[model samples]
Target: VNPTVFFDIAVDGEPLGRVSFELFADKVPKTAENFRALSTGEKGFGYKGSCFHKIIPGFMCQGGDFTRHNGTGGKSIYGEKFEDENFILKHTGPGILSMANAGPNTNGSQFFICTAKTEWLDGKHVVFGKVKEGMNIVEAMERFGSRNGKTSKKITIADCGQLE
Candidate 1:
């Protein structure tokens, strides 16, 4: 099984870089599968053209809401919400990719890439993957548009798939 995935991110119609993620599918099978399917368009939906709706400095850059263009809409591969898989994984440091939910067990397509340490988020969000590379681009995104609400600079997932 592939243990890694890569996503090409863009900003304002320009190439930012590729971000590699080490997926913990063994530990969080369902959550990881959801992310993989969404990222690769295997579920008939993908994160391409999605905006980084929320950006918080020293926190995270949240996006993946391709439907509503905000943080309110997004569904899992199953076409509905799913339970949280917040198990052994913890939000230890930066570059963590985690699910963004309204409350507990509301996992969907919305996710965030941590720009800094957020240990307090442990047990609250599902940490399914970590950024293995291109974190400077992530930081660049943070610095480019680290506003509270939606950013003016467009952040899009150009393509995503398992690393073969």
Candidate 2:
């Protein structure tokens, strides 16, 4: 019961290409639906125009802050924040999407795609999706990530929506 989604991302303004994801709705329906709805933007706001605010090359790349477009703020569709759905998915592979929260049960409109296993992060972040394609674009995203955890030229999800 994993559904697909797509993100047409870019660095600065030029296109970096498309990255598709498969959401584990069968295991984490609540978290998957949150990401699914956010991707569709039927609520009038979602990943579009949002930039990957913070990036750690050896670890993960982050975004989903459609409001402020930064790590400082965002809101969940269920409310300002949603509770952690569960940690059924493991944080053990590259391009796995996981929720990013401030603390316990504080999941908001923020998430990350890991490029490597994060065993220490396993029980904390809710892993819900995996990259189905476009790993090149995902690797390209790392080039701009560095010491500050941000790039001078932004990595934006130029277009986003459900693919299936």
Candidate 3:
């Protein structure tokens, strides 16, 4: 069976809600495990306390830069970077989960959730998962978002872990 993960979100230290995801392990095992390890802190480094540094209203909300709290840095369980598993999955709609990288094969702990259909990013980024629940909280981020992708509020992944 595939794995499900969760992030308890908060804005400026206030509890907003939770957002869960189903990593498509069947289609993308390598990429999916990257997200799972970070979520569960199995590597001692994870997405906990990381902020969604960028939140574009009509695009995706990105985070996972645990080292810098910005869009600057994050490392994977294996190393600072890893290869893209494959591009079989497409960014067909909103709530899509994918990697955030500087260029090809530069994936780390950084990731993003599509708030809209980001078809343009298809094949360019590794589409590894999708939101399984709590899209309302993802949408609510729109209010604290801007056109520039920089967050207007302190949107943080307050806590995160794996689910049975």
Candidate 4:
């Protein structure tokens, strides 16, 4: 039901920090696979300098666009669907990472991390991963109200390999 992904993220090899998440594999296999591919560089789409473009305080931080430095649409749409309750998982609480969608089955690299409980999202969004570590760093990054505003923070997923 849950999967974990550890990351060594940094800017120019300075070791920004580490991040780990428990992914919802069974619930959103397609989304998980897509994320896994991106992380492992298997898809080789190249998202090294992507942004976490949008953030909502006490709600969620959203980003994940390889095409734009900010969260904008450019890449091809990735369509994946499943048979689940209308709202299988609520976006309630922090660490709830889910895919950003423009419409039903039109998810492509955009994801969010919850800062507080958000029961409204549920099955409408694709659940991907849950943060287990680095919550503070993630929280301190920026939100909607920050000076940086909704613009994403420059981050590079230096290496995303499985847990040793």
Candidate achieving the largest lDDT: 3
lDDT of 1 at 92: 82
lDDT of 1 by residue, 70-121 (tens): 7888888866799987658888889998989888988878999898878788
Candidate 2 stretches with Cα past 4 Å from truth are none
Off by over 4 Å in 1: none
lDDT, each prediction: 0.82, 0.89, 0.91, 0.63
Per candidate, the number of residue pairs that clash is 0, 0, 0, 5
lDDT at residue 115 of model 1 (Cα atoms): 85
> What TM-score, computed on C-alpha atoms, does each candidate reach?
0.93, 0.97, 0.97, 0.76
lDDT of 2: 0.89
Task: State the lDDT of candidate 2 residue by residue for 23-95, as single tens digits.
Answer: 9999999999999999999887788879998888888899988888779887788989989888888998898
Off by more than 4 A, model 3: none
Worst 10 residues of 2 by lDDT: 145-154
Per-candidate alpha-carbon RMSD to the true structure: 1.4, 0.9, 0.8, 3.6
Cα lDDT for residue 18, candidate 2? 95
Put the candidates in TM-score order, highest first. 3, 2, 1, 4
Which pairs, if any, clash in model 1? none
Q: How many pairs of residues in model 1 come into backbone collision?
A: 0
Ranking of models by lDDT: 3, 2, 1, 4
